[PDB]
Amino acid sequence: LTNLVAEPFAKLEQDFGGSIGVYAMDTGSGATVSYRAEERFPLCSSFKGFLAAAVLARSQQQAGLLDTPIRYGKNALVPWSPISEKYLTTGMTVAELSAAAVQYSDNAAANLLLKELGGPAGLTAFMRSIGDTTFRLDRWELELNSAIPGDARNTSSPRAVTESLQKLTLGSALAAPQRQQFVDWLKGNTTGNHRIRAAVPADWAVGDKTGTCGVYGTANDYAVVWPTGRAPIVLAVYTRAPNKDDKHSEAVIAAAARLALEGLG
Numbered sequence: 001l002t003n004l005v006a007e008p009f010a011k012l013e014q015d016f017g018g019s020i021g022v023y024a025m026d027t028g029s030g031a032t033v034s035y036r037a038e039e040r041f042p043l044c045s046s047f048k049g050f051l052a053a054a055v056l057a058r059s060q061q062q063a064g065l066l067d068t069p070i071r072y073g074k075n076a077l078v079p080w081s082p083i084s085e086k087y088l089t090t091g092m093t094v095a096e097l098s099a100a101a102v103q104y105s106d107n108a109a110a111n112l113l114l115k116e117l118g119g120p121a122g123l124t125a126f127m128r129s130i131g132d133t134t135f136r137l138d139r140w141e142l143e144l145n146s147a148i149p150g151d152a153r154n155t156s157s158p159r160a161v162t163e164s165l166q167k168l169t170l171g172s173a174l175a176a177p178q179r180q181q182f183v184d185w186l187k188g189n190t191t192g193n194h195r196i197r198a199a200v201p202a203d204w205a206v207g208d209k210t211g212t213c214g215v216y217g218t219a220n221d222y223a224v225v226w227p228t229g230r231a232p233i234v235l236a237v238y239t240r241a242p243n244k245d246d247k248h249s250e251a252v253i254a255a256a257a258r259l260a261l262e263g264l265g
């Protein structure tokens, strides 16, 4: 029979002029909401959350890695580096670069941290090591953002994103001190006020990571949500659209997140 849970998501994507992918897990009950959950969508800047987690994992066994100053020059800067552009002569620690990448989507900080892992291949290998077979990243900023329809490079699925997010924020993929730092970085994100955060009651807590490729209507958000009186919810909302000049929509992301939270048992 027709999937009645799915119908309002299909209407939402049709109104948007593209495709929406959603996965949500109630970690209390095991309930889920799923819509195109296993389809691939471009990661865009949402990869930077997993980047910071991979650096935290490395930091467990490399004493003082997170505390290490990185002295970079202007050759490291690229567009949308509002934090990094301020520390050319003072540097930033690995922890500070991680916070910038997570909480401001700083592009230069992301590329500096990719270098610490052995590039996009190194981050992909970390994701394989936690059991994520879907995540693919093979470019640096800005090239990973092209988001061309049918290109599986630099993509993941809403379900894989959510599964990996739960392992890293609530499960055992990081040691507790590192898990906690990842949570605190996500909670302090500044870029997501119009996406999943706009979908929750104001008294719920949220940690999230956004991404915006912009072209091909492509943008996303994933989050861990601590609802009043409930176990955490983990969810991912990704969008794409067929034409290069199609515009992404924050409001559509928020609307999809609301339907997920409503449908979720």
Ligand SMILES: *[B@@]1([O])O[C]([C]C([O])=O)[C][C][C]1[N]C(=O)[C]C1=[C][C]=[C]S1
Pocket: 044, 045, 046, 079, 080, 104, 105, 107, 142, 145, 191, 209, 210, 211, 212, 213, 214
């Ligand atoms: B990233 O894909 O997304 C960031 C914004 C976000 O977290 O939602 C900005 C940096 C990356 N994108 C780009 O460099 C292109 C941009 C899109 C809108 C602002 S910059």
